[PDB]
């Protein structure tokens, strides 16, 4: 059935686009981490 | 010819580990018909499927 596979052809290709919008609209702040603590700390060196 | 099913069956039917089972490589077409625990039991008695011998551990040294 060509009628058949043309249709699950479209849907897949439509769907897959709409999961792209999601990874992009999310993308900007996805790395937002309140309360992130840097593993690395550097002593500020000065003598009073 | 994907035999991963029939090899899992034979193991249960012949009452032994998968690793001791042996499927005749020339009957591959044949075995592919199995698909049922009953079918398999023909194939065991028939001889086209076989139980390999336990690998030998001798105590003779000890």
């Amino acid at each position: 059935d060509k009628k058949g596979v043309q249709t699950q052809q479209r849907v897949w290709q439509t769907e897959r686009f709409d999961k792209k919008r999601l990874d992009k609209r999310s993308a900007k702040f996805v790395n937002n981490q309140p309360h992130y603590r840097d593993q690395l700390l550097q002593r500020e060196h000065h003598h009073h | 010819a994907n035999l991963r099913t029939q090899k899992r069956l034979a193991a249960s039917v012949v009452g032994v580990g998968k690793r001791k089972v042996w499927l005749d490589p020339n009957e591959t077409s044949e075995i592919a018909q199995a698909n049922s625990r009953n079918a398999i039991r023909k194939l065991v008695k028939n001889g086209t499927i076989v139980k390999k011998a336990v690998t030998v551990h001798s105590k003779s040294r000890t």
Partner: protein, 183 residues
């Protein structure tokens, strides 16, 4: 339809195009420029040899940090590769365009690739995972490839000289003199 820029007579040329191919864009752009301008059967026999590591594809634009190779020498470049997957999709097209040239009843021996162009198709997107719990885009760079093969004609030799001679009253009289001198 609606191909890229064409200098070709449409009746004597056959064309084929794939779209949304899963291949590097940067890599295909490289294998494209390679076989551009060549005679068709040359192109194919050559692409064959690249699969074998006999010849190579010179990387002339996106080369950065590519390795040096001997095989580069042929085209006078030190940076070259053998992009297998690119080559497949180009072979696949060249085989096709050669078939369309057949059902158009053109002469196969006189064919050569006139115009071959590849631009970038919409990115596709997965995620990857980075230290300190971050996320990054991890992306395919699909391509559209189009190619037009032509039947070679050296048959054009045209003489067009358009003479509008603007001469002053002085230059006319002065050409006159030279004619009275029996030159």
């Amino acid at each position: 339809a609606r191909y890229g820029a064409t200098s070709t007579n449409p009746a004597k040329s056959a064309s084929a195009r794939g779209s949304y191919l899963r291949v590097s864009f940067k890599n295909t752009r490289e294998t494209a420029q390679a076989i551009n301008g060549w005679e068709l059967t040359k192109a194919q026999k050559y692409l064959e040899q690249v699969l074998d590591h006999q010849r190579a594809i010179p990387f002339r634009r996106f080369n950065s940090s590519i390795g040096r190779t001997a095989q580069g020498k042929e085209f006078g470049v030190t940076k070259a590769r053998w992009p297998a997957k690119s080559v497949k999709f180009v072979q696949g097209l060249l085989q096709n365009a050669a078939a369309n040239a057949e059902a158009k009843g053109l002469d196969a021996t006189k064919l050569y690739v006139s115009h071959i162009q590849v631009n970038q198709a919409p990115k596709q997107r997965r995620r990857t995972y980075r230290a300190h719990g971050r996320i990054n885009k991890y992306e395919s760079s699909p391509s559209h490839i189009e190619l037009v093969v032509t039947e070679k004609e050296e048959a054009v030799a045209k003489a067009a000289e358009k003479k509008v001679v603007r001469l002053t009253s002085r230059q006319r009289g002065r050409i006159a003199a030279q004619k009275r001198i029996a030159a």
